[PDB]
Amino acid sequence: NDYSRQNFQDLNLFRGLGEDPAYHPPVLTDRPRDWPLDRWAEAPRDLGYSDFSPYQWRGLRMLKDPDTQAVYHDMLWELRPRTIVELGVYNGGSLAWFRDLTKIMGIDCQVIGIDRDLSRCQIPASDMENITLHQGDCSDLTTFEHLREMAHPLIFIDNAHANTFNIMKWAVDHLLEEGDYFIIEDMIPYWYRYAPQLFSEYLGAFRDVLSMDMLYANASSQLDRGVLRRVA
Amino acid sequence: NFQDLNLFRGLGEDPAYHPPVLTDRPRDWPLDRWAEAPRDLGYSDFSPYQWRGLRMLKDPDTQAVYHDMLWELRPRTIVELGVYNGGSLAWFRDLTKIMGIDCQVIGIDRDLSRCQIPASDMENITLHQGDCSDLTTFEHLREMAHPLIFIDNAHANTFNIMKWAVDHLLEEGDYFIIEDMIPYWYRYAPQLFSEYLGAFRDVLSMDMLYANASSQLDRGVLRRVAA
Amino acid sequence: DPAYHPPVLTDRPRDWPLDRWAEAPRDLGYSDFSPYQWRGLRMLKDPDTQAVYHDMLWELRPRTIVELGVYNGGSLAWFRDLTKIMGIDCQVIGIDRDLSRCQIPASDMENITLHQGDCHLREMAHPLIFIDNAHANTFNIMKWAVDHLLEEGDYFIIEDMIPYWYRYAPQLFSEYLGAFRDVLSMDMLYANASSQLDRGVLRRVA
Amino acid sequence: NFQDLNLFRGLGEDPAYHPPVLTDRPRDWPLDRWAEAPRDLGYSDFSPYQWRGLRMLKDPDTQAVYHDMLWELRPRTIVELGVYNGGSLAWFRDLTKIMGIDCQVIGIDRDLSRCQIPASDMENITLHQGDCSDLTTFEHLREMAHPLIFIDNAHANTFNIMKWAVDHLLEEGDYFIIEDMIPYWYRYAPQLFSEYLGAFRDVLSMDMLYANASSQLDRGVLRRVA
Amino acid sequence: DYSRQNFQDLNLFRGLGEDPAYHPPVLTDRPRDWPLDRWAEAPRDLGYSDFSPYQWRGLRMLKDPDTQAVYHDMLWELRPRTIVELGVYNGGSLAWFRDLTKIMGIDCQVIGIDRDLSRCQIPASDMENITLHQGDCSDLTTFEHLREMAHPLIFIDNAHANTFNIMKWAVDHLLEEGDYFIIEDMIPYWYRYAPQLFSEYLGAFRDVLSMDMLYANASSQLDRGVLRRV
Amino acid sequence: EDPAYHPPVLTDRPRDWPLDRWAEAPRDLGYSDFSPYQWRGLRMLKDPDTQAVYHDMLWELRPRTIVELGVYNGGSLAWFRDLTKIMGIDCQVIGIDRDLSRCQIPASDMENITLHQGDCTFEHLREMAHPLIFIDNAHANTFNIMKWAVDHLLEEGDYFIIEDMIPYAFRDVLSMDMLYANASSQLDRGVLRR
Numbered sequence A: 001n002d003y004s005r006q007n008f009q010d011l012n013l014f015r016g017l018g019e020d021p022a023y024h025p026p027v028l029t030d031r032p033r034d035w036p037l038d039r040w041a042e043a044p045r046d047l048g049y050s051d052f053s054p055y056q057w058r059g060l061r062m063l064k065d066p067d068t069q070a071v072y073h074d075m076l077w078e079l080r081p082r083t084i085v086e087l088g089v090y091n092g093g094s095l096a097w098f099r100d101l102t103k104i105m106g107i108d109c110q111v112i113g114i115d116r117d118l119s120r121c122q123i124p125a126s127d128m129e130n131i132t133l134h135q136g137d138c139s140d141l142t143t144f145e146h147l148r149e150m151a152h153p154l155i156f157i158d159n160a161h162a163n164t165f166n167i168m169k170w171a172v173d174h175l176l177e178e179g180d181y182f183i184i185e186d187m188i189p190y191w192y193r194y195a196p197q198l199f200s201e202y203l204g205a206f207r208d209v210l211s212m213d214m215l216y217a218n219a220s221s222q223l224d225r226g227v228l229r230r231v232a
Numbered sequence B: 001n002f003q004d005l006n007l008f009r010g011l012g013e014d015p016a017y018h019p020p021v022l023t024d025r026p027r028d029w030p031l032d033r034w035a036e037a038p039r040d041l042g043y044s045d046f047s048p049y050q051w052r053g054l055r056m057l058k059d060p061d062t063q064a065v066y067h068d069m070l071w072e073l074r075p076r077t078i079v080e081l082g083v084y085n086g087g088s089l090a091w092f093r094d095l096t097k098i099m100g101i102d103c104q105v106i107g108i109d110r111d112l113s114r115c116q117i118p119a120s121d122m123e124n125i126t127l128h129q130g131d132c133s134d135l136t137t138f139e140h141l142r143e144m145a146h147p148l149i150f151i152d153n154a155h156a157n158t159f160n161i162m163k164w165a166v167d168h169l170l171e172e173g174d175y176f177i178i179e180d181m182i183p184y185w186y187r188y189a190p191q192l193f194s195e196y197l198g199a200f201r202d203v204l205s206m207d208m209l210y211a212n213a214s215s216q217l218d219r220g221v222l223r224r225v226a227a
Numbered sequence C: 001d002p003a004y005h006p007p008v009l010t011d012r013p014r015d016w017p018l019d020r021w022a023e024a025p026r027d028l029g030y031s032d033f034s035p036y037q038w039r040g041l042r043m044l045k046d047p048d049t050q051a052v053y054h055d056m057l058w059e060l061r062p063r064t065i066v067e068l069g070v071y072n073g074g075s076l077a078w079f080r081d082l083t084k085i086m087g088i089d090c091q092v093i094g095i096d097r098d099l100s101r102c103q104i105p106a107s108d109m110e111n112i113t114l115h116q117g118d119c120h121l122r123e124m125a126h127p128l129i130f131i132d133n134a135h136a137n138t139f140n141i142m143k144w145a146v147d148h149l150l151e152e153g154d155y156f157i158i159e160d161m162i163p164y165w166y167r168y169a170p171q172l173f174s175e176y177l178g179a180f181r182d183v184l185s186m187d188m189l190y191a192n193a194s195s196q197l198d199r200g201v202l203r204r205v206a
Numbered sequence D: 001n002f003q004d005l006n007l008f009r010g011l012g013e014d015p016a017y018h019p020p021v022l023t024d025r026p027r028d029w030p031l032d033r034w035a036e037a038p039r040d041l042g043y044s045d046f047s048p049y050q051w052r053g054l055r056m057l058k059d060p061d062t063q064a065v066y067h068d069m070l071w072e073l074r075p076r077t078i079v080e081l082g083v084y085n086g087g088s089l090a091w092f093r094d095l096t097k098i099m100g101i102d103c104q105v106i107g108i109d110r111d112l113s114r115c116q117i118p119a120s121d122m123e124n125i126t127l128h129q130g131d132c133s134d135l136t137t138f139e140h141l142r143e144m145a146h147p148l149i150f151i152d153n154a155h156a157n158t159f160n161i162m163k164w165a166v167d168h169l170l171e172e173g174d175y176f177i178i179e180d181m182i183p184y185w186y187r188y189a190p191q192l193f194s195e196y197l198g199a200f201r202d203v204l205s206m207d208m209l210y211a212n213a214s215s216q217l218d219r220g221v222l223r224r225v226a
Numbered sequence E: 001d002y003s004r005q006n007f008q009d010l011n012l013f014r015g016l017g018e019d020p021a022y023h024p025p026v027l028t029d030r031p032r033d034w035p036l037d038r039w040a041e042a043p044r045d046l047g048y049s050d051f052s053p054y055q056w057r058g059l060r061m062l063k064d065p066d067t068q069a070v071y072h073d074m075l076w077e078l079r080p081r082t083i084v085e086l087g088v089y090n091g092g093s094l095a096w097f098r099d100l101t102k103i104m105g106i107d108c109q110v111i112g113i114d115r116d117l118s119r120c121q122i123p124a125s126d127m128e129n130i131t132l133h134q135g136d137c138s139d140l141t142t143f144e145h146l147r148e149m150a151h152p153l154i155f156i157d158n159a160h161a162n163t164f165n166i167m168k169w170a171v172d173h174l175l176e177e178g179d180y181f182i183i184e185d186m187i188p189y190w191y192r193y194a195p196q197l198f199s200e201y202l203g204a205f206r207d208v209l210s211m212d213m214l215y216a217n218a219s220s221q222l223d224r225g226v227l228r229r230v
Numbered sequence F: 001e002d003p004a005y006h007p008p009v010l011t012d013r014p015r016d017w018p019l020d021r022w023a024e025a026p027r028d029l030g031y032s033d034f035s036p037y038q039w040r041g042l043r044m045l046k047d048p049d050t051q052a053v054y055h056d057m058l059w060e061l062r063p064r065t066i067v068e069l070g071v072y073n074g075g076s077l078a079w080f081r082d083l084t085k086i087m088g089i090d091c092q093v094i095g096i097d098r099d100l101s102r103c104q105i106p107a108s109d110m111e112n113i114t115l116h117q118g119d120c121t122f123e124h125l126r127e128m129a130h131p132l133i134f135i136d137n138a139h140a141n142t143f144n145i146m147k148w149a150v151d152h153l154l155e156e157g158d159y160f161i162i163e164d165m166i167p168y169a170f171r172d173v174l175s176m177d178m179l180y181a182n183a184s185s186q187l188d189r190g191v192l193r194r
């Protein structure tokens, strides 16, 4: 009766993330890594490992999949952002990804990660140039009052999905200049499904300051109808 | 002051039921233009279902499964962690009564303020308020008659509740059923999940008659096996 | 067989051990021809049809449901039971030229009536749902129902064979349905909510 | 007077990158009208990808595979066979550079005319003119450092180019990757393709970790097993 | 064993296959004589390659039955006295057109053109009303030496080489009102890969040629490539 | 009910679409496709996929007889006779059908087509050559007809095909031919020889 010798963690803590912030390359269970060429037709055509979140960057985990990466690439090339703000850092993968990418395009960009819990961050202390971390909860806006003068243009991204609309109002009133993005990843389609009448009303409240950018907005399952930018 | 839309994940934005309102078509299509009528549903299909004017979050396939399960087991108690609007509570009571079964339905939740069942229709339904994370929410329960079906719809602290139920509640043949979450937990944490479930190998089995019979019950229908 | 028998698993044990959870097969374990039921009687109405009928019953609150085509009576017991628990005073009536196959015992036979044969006597209370489940001679019965039976609001419903009639003879189907343009309409809240009632839910208009 | 439209098969009509254009919707959509906004990409998806303003014919899925492979292998050499606009060359040289890998990137093509890489942005990238019909092209690969990834993206004389790579170029753990074409060679020449591949059974295995990970690499990632 | 071979250029087989002769596909993972007790547990899948499995009289047919059904209608309606095919290969299509016009009682000459007739598998026994010409498509002389043809006429492009110049020729020197010029296969690919130039080139013939809408959406292979003289 | 063939007519779009508006043309079929297939101006209730399976079958088997329960307007019969004739096979095509009237096939096109009137064989059916294909296209009394053919008609190698009604217990003297069973939706699991 192994269960009574056992206490059980709560598995909800792994929703959208997984058991480990550390990256580990996948592993073939039911087949050799080296399939021989005489039997090439008989090889299995499926992936061989879980496609839940297999993506990485320089040995850090990456929760933004390749289609998303192509959109952010295009968006960086066009906008040439002076600042990027990730909300929800997790393991640090996409922070390093944004900083490395702006560096290669020759863009002088400051990458800023905010989070509840930076203990999960996996970025070498040496590989941290042009990056700044901030512990703080989205749930209360002082996390954003406290930080200051960011250069523009500016991309603000919500991967945390918490207090999102109050943060969006904070951003329009106190941060975003014309042409700056505010991107809500993953979540906007679910909120519409679960709460159509409230979701539409909330989005609509921003009818005069934010518009959805139809050039990037339909270009990845993750950014799906979530890519917004400042007007007026 | 924007409400936090996460609150509504899996539930909806209003516990009260309202019938679908057609938006780009009249209710009455003229038969001379029968073929040109749009063949799609017409409404939002997120949780369209009802039972006597109360919302139903269990879709029709799931309901078919429970009908069969109730018919075979003939449970004398049904317990639901997660009550919400009460739809499924009243359904269970209503169905067991139609089948002639003497069944108490008990419902447990940390917030009962959303319940929509009129007290005139509360016969054989017992609501208790508690948090899954406190185990006393369960130790406070009075003796229950068997067979019994324990259903997790709240998904918090689920495995320690399984440990509790195996040890203090379930007689052989009784069901501990986890709706919806098993496939997600397995996707997000495949190893931990496997080890956890497997730790119940001696006391619970997966019932294959039902475990593949509905999208919501999928791989979550479990029963107390002989010691 | 009209009698109901639970599904039997030929390739799986019913009790799959938890230590091998991931290895369990994901398909249903048996045929999905007609595995539905209601209190030990067979139900040919799949769960989506059940839901539409539930909804229909709840808003209309029918005084009379008439089922042309009975088979074994499970749908008849379902209508009666469901109308009882909603509080609706409803008379289920079931008409088939052959009734031998009917499994309902004479005890829970309250508010149910069987007639055998074609055409007759309706001093029956409205609102009414008429369900054509005997897929022969349909458009004739539809004219017959509009001339003798149907009042405003009342439904006439064609299960199963509607999309098949547009498949085989499309020109005639449309003409034959378009002949009732002035009397019946297609209720678009239910007419797309089930494969079995798909585009077969009609109701008297005026 | 009409050009041979077959020339553009797989490539496109201009090797320079032109950003996509929205055919029938404004770029800004009013947020009060969000539910009504269209849902499909909004332009042609044939080959809309890019790296630093140059076209990339490797899509994001292929890009992710190569990243993984490059992180693990840490190749001292990558040889693209068939160049076109040079997008891949620029990309590989960049990805290795960020990754702290000291990597040479060689492009080989009969036609280097359509290469769009500026001369300023050309460190660790060398280009060689030459035909796959003839093997002295590859013979002057001046024993570049290892490990090495060799990729076929032109597809002429490909099986002879492989017998050569095995005997004179490749070492244990080096890659030989045929993009796009292997599933087409198997559809069309089931018998012959299956003989030719497999004639290399003692010298090359298919690496299953990367071999089913994108459409373009599908059943095409091979490596030297000595 | 790799050193002990010289490999053919497998591109040679693009859209053709490796063998002009028809070989009937055989089952691999199962016998052909399944038992009737096990009728339920027999699989739904075809059981073979599905690439270009079709045939006519022991000759490989590269036009799939869907495309074949629409030519049957087109021949029946128009009743052509001449059918030109560019791209012959095994001669399957040639013999099919010939056999179908004949069974339909039409006096139709089929004419097949190709740079390489070595691959043709039609017995001479069954060569009636078939005229082959060897010539390269990117070479207007190939067409200039074509004798007079009776009308109506259906001209079909299966070689897809120098195609637009050939339409220009066909429009200037062959096609009378009613006649068809039909590009099979290539058109969708040409619109994925060169949408600007393809649109420009087609609109060049706007005044002389039209997309026949009764046939052009009707098979995968003819999809958007069926055209005729206004 | 219409046994005669009529070519589909368009509705919303012209037949002649301009090539300067080529990219904008409608990509859908433009008309219903219940069964708009003909052979030589006669309707025909074979998909092109079914047409191709039978073709392969006639070419391999080379039947000296084809029987066909249900005829309708005669397409199949003419088609079969024409196909065996083009293939040089000496085949007789028998069409059996209770309502013979529908048959549009004209007298001058009947060589190797014999029609018999009747309901589902039972007499007025004489000795015929093999190999034989037998086709049930009229799905009443289909199973008694199987045993009867199995006991009085089918020799080894001969087929018996059920056409349309086979998704909706004979292992000793029959078998399912797996080369053609899956190859078309209309013959889904209906192709059974010996």
Ligand SMILES: Nc1ncnc2c1ncn2[C@@H]1O[C@H](CSCC[C@H](N)C(=O)O)[C@@H](O)[C@H]1O
Binding pocket: A017, A061, A062, A063, A064, A086, A087, A088, A089, A090, A091, A093, A094, A095, A114, A115, A116, A117, A136, A137, A138, A139, A159, A160, A162
């Ligand atoms: N209320 C809250 N306030 C701040 N951070 C929160 C939060 N709720 C969740 N989070 C954080 O949100 C993160 C989501 S994962 C972040 C994904 C990452 N930006 C990438 O794309 O690679 C977690 O690290 C979690 O700790």
Ligand SMILES: Nc1ncnc2c1ncn2[C@@H]1O[C@H](CSCC[C@H](N)C(=O)O)[C@@H](O)[C@H]1O
Binding pocket: B010, B011, B057, B058, B080, B081, B082, B083, B084, B085, B086, B087, B088, B089, B108, B109, B110, B111, B130, B131, B132, B133, B153, B154, B155, B156
């Ligand atoms: N820790 C916790 N303890 C008790 N209930 C909780 C909880 N966390 C969430 N819940 C409750 O879980 C419920 C689950 S939704 C219930 C589903 C519905 N009654 C059905 O039968 O299908 C919500 O009402 C929520 O209030």
Ligand SMILES: Nc1ncnc2c1ncn2[C@@H]1O[C@H](CSCC[C@H](N)C(=O)O)[C@@H](O)[C@H]1O
Binding pocket: D011, D057, D058, D080, D081, D082, D083, D084, D088, D108, D109, D110, D111, D130, D131, D132, D133, D153, D154, D155, D156
């Ligand atoms: N016989 C041959 N010898 C050398 N190069 C050839 C060749 N045939 C075709 N090519 C070249 O092959 C190239 C194919 S496109 C190259 C694809 C691109 N490098 C990518 O990353 O996907 C063309 O540039 C063409 O010039």
Ligand SMILES: Nc1ncnc2c1ncn2[C@@H]1O[C@H](CSCC[C@H](N)C(=O)O)[C@@H](O)[C@H]1O
Binding pocket: E015, E016, E062, E086, E087, E088, E089, E113, E114, E115, E116, E135, E136, E137, E138, E158, E159, E160, E161, E184, E185
């Ligand atoms: N330029 C050219 N001139 C004449 N024939 C050519 C040609 N290019 C290719 N062909 C020949 O014509 C055929 C065209 S390629 C094969 C076409 C095939 N029927 C299809 O549509 O997919 C081959 O038989 C080839 O030998």
Ligand SMILES: Nc1ncnc2c1ncn2[C@@H]1O[C@H](CSCC[C@H](N)C(=O)O)[C@@H](O)[C@H]1O
Binding pocket: F043, F044, F045, F046, F069, F070, F071, F072, F073, F074, F075, F076, F096, F097, F098, F099, F102, F118, F119, F120, F137, F138, F139, F140
């Ligand atoms: N029970 C029965 N006895 C004899 N004929 C029948 C029959 N049931 C249906 N039929 C006839 O069989 C025909 C079936 S339709 C036959 C279609 C034919 N194979 C084709 O492709 O063209 C109809 O003409 C109908 O009149």
